[PDB]
Design a protein around this ligand. Structure first.
Ligand code: MG
Ligand code: MG
Ligand code: NA
Length: 385
């Protein structure tokens, strides 16, 4: 289960670089130089890295310092063959963003947030990124009167529309991906789930430029089924990027390594991504726990990729097994894929077998055979076939 760059595994600089500061504790690890992270991740078999502006260029850097930070990073990419498929903006750490970036009540903060974002879009394009992520972690509220949500959505739309005008005007081949999260650090965050983000995109001026960047743990913070949400995003043609990690239920955002947390949900996710032919990066947004030293950081990162590869093997074996294919037919998955009424509305209305002469009791007595199917899936996941 050895990863290679062809597997398209990517990591944020802020993941392996997380120093371990949590709400109740100081950092347990020293800061990593981005150049070291690129080299170490390349040695593990990663394909690329991603960054927030402020991960790569310290906030407040002069133009000359900015140039030197980028030059050093580009040489590390050249030395390793690592790519940068995605970039994003930090609109959450600095105190100026305490009430949001794009939806801050203060208008001057909203304008600054847009300018900070635009500057990093230029850099992302320079480095070859194809997707630009926006996680609106400060967009929201702790109390009901603090934020008129209709006005906030107007401001959010305004911001994204302006960004779309900018990339179109410059001729950039980049697309945007909105990352939902239901809460934390705000009491409630705007666009809290994949569904809300997909709905919002349809009201933008150029919806084709925007998709979603769902994160395993974030949907699980609302108790939702992550594979189901991914299926809806794929169905809409909007899965532009994905963040892979683990989460143990409804609590603070844990960002565990992928495969930890809900293991069976991870299996069904990999099955879906591979079956659907998702071709984007397999990006890990995770935090090595603060109990770990640097050897544990790299072990945790390697484990992300290993677990994806094991699950990919098991899901492929499941789908290829003739006994599973028979069980899928026994459960009528084949019929689910056939149209209900390709004969059309009038034919349906005239079809006595659909109502007047339908034997509801005979249909009700048919078992779905779902438990046998699910036990075959369990056996395959555990390698007990
Ligand atoms: Mg998270
Ligand atoms: Mg994320
Ligand atoms: Na737009």
């Amino acid at each position: 289960y050895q990863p290679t760059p062809e597997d398209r595994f990517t990591f944020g600089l802020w993941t392996v670089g997380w120093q371990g500061r949590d709400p109740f504790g100081d950092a347990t690890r020293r800061a990593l130089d981005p150049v070291e992270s690129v080299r170490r991740l390349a040695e593990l078999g990663a394909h690329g890295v991603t960054f927030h502006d402020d991960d790569l260029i310290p906030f407040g850097s002069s133009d000359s310092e900015r140039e030197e930070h980028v030059k050093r990073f580009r040489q590390a990419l050249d030395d390793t063959g690592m790519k940068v498929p995605m970039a994003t903006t930090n609109l959450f750490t600095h105190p100026v963003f305490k009430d949001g970036g794009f939806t801050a009540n203060d208008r001057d903060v909203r304008r600054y947030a847009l300018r900070k974002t635009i500057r990093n879009i230029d850099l992302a394009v320079e480095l070859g990124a194809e997707t630009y992520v926006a996680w609106g972690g400060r967009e929201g509220a702790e109390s009901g009167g603090a934020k008129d949500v209709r006005d906030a959505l107007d401001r959010m739309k305004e911001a994204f529309d302006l960004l779309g005008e900018y990339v179109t005007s410059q001729g950039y081949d980049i697309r945007f991906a909105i990352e939902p999260k239901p809460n934390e650090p705000r009491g409630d965050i705007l666009l809290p789930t994949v569904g809300h983000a997909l709905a919002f995109i349809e009201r933008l001026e150029r919806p084709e430029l925007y998709g979603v960047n769902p994160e395993v743990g974030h949907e699980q913070m609302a108790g939702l089924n992550f594979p189901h949400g991914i299926a809806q995003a794929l169905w809409a043609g909007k899965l532009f990027h994905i963040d892979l990690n683990g989460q143990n239920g409804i609590k603070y955002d844990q960002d565990l390594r992928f495969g930890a947390g809900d293991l069976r949900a991870a299996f069904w996710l990999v099955d879906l991504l591979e079956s659907a032919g998702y071709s984007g990066p397999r990006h890990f947004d995770f935090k090595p726990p603060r109990t770990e030293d640097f050897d544990g950081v790299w072990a945790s990162a390697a484990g992300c990729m290993r677990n994806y590869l094991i699950l990919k093997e098991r899901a492929a074996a499941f789908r290829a097994d003739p006994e599973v294919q028979e069980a899928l037919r026994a459960s009528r998955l084949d019929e689910l894929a056939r149209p209900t009424a390709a004969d059309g509305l009038q034919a349906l209305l005239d079809d006595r077998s659909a109502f007047e002469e339908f034997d509801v009791d005979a249909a009700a007595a048919r078992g779905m055979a779902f438990e046998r199917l699910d036990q075959l899936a369990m056996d395959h996941l555990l390698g007990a076939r």
